[PDB]
């Protein structure tokens, strides 16, 4: 085509294309290499990606995200019923299937999870098209290893609706291993551990690879642990700080909280490269600016338990795979959160100093591998 590889993420999506033996992780119209898996509806327009997430704080009811948590599931599914209680948007039941309901151009409308995700894939498709200067048709789209047939089918349908011919649906951990060339035959079988920590979910997958054939040995994790949870710890920290300094609680002002959450997410990323970060918010509450800062140490302490807890699923995955730490040949980092120095330290210490595969941006590794496989299938 060339064909492309797309990581349809829980919170961010990424598209890459393999040309001249190299993978190109494609930047969007705003120059970002990953795009929010968001879609918004207003009185006049449908927004997608950066444009949608950039207005989430002011239009919470009609800004959709987490469609991946609904995709391929039934309305009465326990997880679906549990998640709805936390989303600002409506999820309704249509013949037993979940649909998000929103207001668009003054009218009420509902979309299936695959329709919402097709909008995200369309955005990724156009992003690739703007870079290639050519129409993009074929693509490989990834999914978590634990996805069932219905979830895989619905993800594929999201692609078809986007005008893409889905060459294949492959597992995210497998895509990651392919990015590092771990799929090449080298004689005996090799055990690869994929440590994936994104913005909303945590997954540990152990794969055994032999003759280019992957075998998911075990999967562990927490579908409700991700970078967004680390931002929450920071948010509460600063809400307390603002109350101390100004004797005012901003907790009930949904927008002040989102602007603070956005500032924390940005500071967090900085703390992965530097030891301190400055928070500066103009007019956060009742015209009061919030200028402060936070140290990496402070950040690590606010999340110490959450970070350390990532090691339990690692132990359990090993146990279920019937392998000992020492039998793992490669450890691959996936997800933007794995860029956090403390998490790398924890994982490495657990593996007694073993080096981590982390040269490819973790939040891009899945798209990277998908792009490689998409080319191979073309």
Q: Residues comprising the binding site for ATP?
A: 9-12, 68, 199-201, 265-272, 336-339
Question: Which one among 6, 10, 51, 171 touches ligand ADP, defined by CB under 6 A?
Answer: 10
Q: Collapse the DSSP code of 39 into the 3-class scheme (helix H, G, I; strand E, B; otherwise coil) and give the result.
A: strand
Contacts of 236-245 with C-beta under 8 Å, sequence gap 24+, read 237/294, 237/298, 237/302, 238/264, 238/279, 238/290, 238/292, 238/294, 241/292, 242/284, 242/285, 242/288, 242/290
Please tell me whether residue 172 binds K ion under the rule CB under 5 A. no
Taking the complex as a whole, the smallest distance from the CB of residue 279 to K ion amounts, in Å, to 26
Range in contact with ligand ADP (rule: CB under 6 A) among 19-27, 119-127, 147-155, 264-272: 264-272
Instruction: Compute CA distances 172 → 10, 34, 146, 225, 332, whole Å.
Output: 12, 16, 10, 17, 12
Under rule CB under 5 A, which residues in 228-287 are in contact with K ion? none
Taking the complex as a whole, the smallest distance from the CB of residue 334 to Mg ion amounts, in Å, to 6
Under rule CB under 5 A, which residues in 17-36 are in contact with Cl ion? 28-29
Cβ neighbors of 191 (< 8 A, separation 6 or more) are 206, 207, 208, 217, 321, 323, 327, 328, 329, 330
Helix crossing, 227-246 with 296-308: angle to 10°? Answer: 130
What are the backbone dihedrals phi and psi of residue 25, each rounded to the nearest 5 degrees, phi first?
A: -85, 115
Instruction: Tell me whether residue 191 or residue 347 sits nearer to ligand ADP (CB atom).
Output: 347
CA distance 302 to 119: 36
Taking the complex as a whole, the smallest distance from the CB of residue 181 to Cl ion amounts, in Å, to 30
Residues 9-48, mask of contacts with K ion (x by CB under 5 A)? x--x------------------------------------
CA distance 300 to 78: 33
Taking the complex as a whole, the smallest distance from the CB of residue 364 to K ion amounts, in Å, to 8
Taking the complex as a whole, the smallest distance from the CB of residue 283 to Mg ion amounts, in Å, to 34
Instruction: Tell me whether residue 223 or residue 253 sits nearer to ligand ADP (CB atom).
Output: 223
Given ligand ADP, Cl ion, Mg ion, none, residue 29, with its beta carbon under 5 to 8 Å by kind, binds Cl ion
Please tell me whether residue 227 binds ligand ADP under the rule CB under 6 A. yes
Most distant CA pair in the chain, distance? 67
Taking the complex as a whole, the smallest distance from the CB of residue 30 to Cl ion amounts, in Å, to 6
For residue 124, the surrounding DSSP H or E stretch is helix 113-132
Q: Are strands 35-36 and 22-25 parallel, antiparallel or unpaired?
A: unpaired
**Structure tokens of 226?**
């991700």
What are the backbone dihedrals phi and psi of residue 327, each rounded to the nearest 5 degrees, phi first?
A: -85, 0
Instruction: Tell me whether residue 198 or residue 369 sits nearer to Mg ion (CB atom).
Output: 198
Please tell me whether residue 310 binds ligand ADP under the rule CB under 6 A. no
Please tell me whether residue 303 binds Cl ion under the rule CB under 5 A. no
Given ligand ADP, Mg ion, Cl ion, none, residue 351, with its beta carbon under 5 to 8 Å by kind, binds none
Q: How many residues lie near K ion (CB under 5 A)?
A: 3
Q: Collapse the DSSP code of 217 into the 3-class scheme (helix H, G, I; strand E, B; otherwise coil) and give the result.
A: strand
Q: Looking at the DSSP assignment, which residues form a beta bridge with residue 14?
A: 7
Question: Which one among 2, 198, 221, 313 touches ligand ADP, defined by CB under 6 A?
Answer: 198
Q: Collapse the DSSP code of 19 into the 3-class scheme (helix H, G, I; strand E, B; otherwise coil) and give the result.
A: strand
Under rule CB under 6 A, which residues in 12-51 are in contact with ligand ADP? 12, 34
Instruction: Tell me whether residue 69 or residue 125 sits nearer to Cl ion (CB atom).
Output: 125
Taking the complex as a whole, the smallest distance from the CB of residue 67 to Cl ion amounts, in Å, to 18
Please tell me whether residue 312 binds Cl ion under the rule CB under 5 A. no
Question: Which one among 140, 336, 368, 370 touches ligand ADP, defined by CB under 6 A?
Answer: 336
C-beta of residue 155 within 8 angstroms of C-beta of residue 141: yes
For binding to Cl ion (CB under 5 A), which residues are involved? 28-29
For binding to ligand ADP (CB under 6 A), which residues are involved? 9-12, 34, 198-200, 226-228, 265, 268-269, 272, 335-337, 339-340, 363
């Amino acid at each position: 085509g060339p064909a492309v590889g797309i990581d349809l993420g829980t919170t961010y999506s990424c598209v890459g294309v393999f040309q001249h033996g190299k993978v190109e992780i494609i930047a969007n119209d705003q120059g970002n290499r990953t795009t929010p898996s968001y879609v918004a509806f207003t009185d006049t327009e449908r927004l997608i990606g950066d444009a949608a997430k950039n207005q989430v704080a002011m239009n919470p009811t009609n800004t959709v995200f987490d469609a991946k948590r609904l995709i391929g599931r039934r309305f009465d599914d326990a997880v679906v019923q549990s998640d709805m209680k936390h989303w600002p948007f409506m999820v309704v039941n249509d013949a037993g299937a979940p649909k998000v309901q929103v207001e668009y151009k003054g009218e009420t409308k509902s979309f299936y999870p695959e329709e919402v995700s097709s909008m995200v894939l369309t955005k990724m498709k156009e992003i690739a098209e703007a870079y290639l200067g050519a129409t993009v048709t074929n693509a490989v789209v990834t999914v978590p290893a634990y996805f069932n047939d219905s979830q895989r089918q619905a993800t594929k349908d999201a692609g078809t609706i986007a005008g893409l011919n889905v060459l294949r649906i492959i597992n995210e951990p497998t895509a990651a291993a392919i990015a590092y060339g771990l799929d090449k035959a080298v004689g005996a079988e090799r055990n690869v551990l994929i440590f994936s920590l994104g913005g909303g979910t945590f997954d540990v997958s152990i794969l055994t690879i032999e003759d280019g054939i992957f075998e998911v040995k075990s999967t562990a994790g927490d579908t409700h642990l991700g970078g967004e949870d680390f931002d929450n710890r920071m948010v509460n920290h600063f809400i307390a700080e603002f109350k101390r300094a100004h004797a005012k609680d901003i907790s009930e002002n949904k927008r002040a909280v989102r602007r603070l959450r956005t500032a924390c997410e940005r500071a967090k990323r900085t703390l992965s490269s530097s030891t301190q970060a400055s928070i500066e918010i103009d007019s956060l509450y009742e015209g009061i600016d919030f200028y402060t800062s936070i140290t990496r140490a402070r950040f690590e302490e606010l999340n110490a338990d959450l970070f350390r807890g990532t090691l339990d699923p690692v132990e359990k995955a090993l146990r279920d795979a019937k392998l000992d730490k020492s039998q793992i040949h490669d450890i691959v980092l996936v997800g933007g959160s794995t860029r956090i120095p403390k998490i790398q330290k924890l994982l490495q210490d657990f593996f007694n100093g073993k080096e981590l595969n982390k040269s490819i941006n973790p939040d891009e590794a899945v798209a990277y591998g998908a792009a490689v496989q998409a080319a191979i299938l073309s």
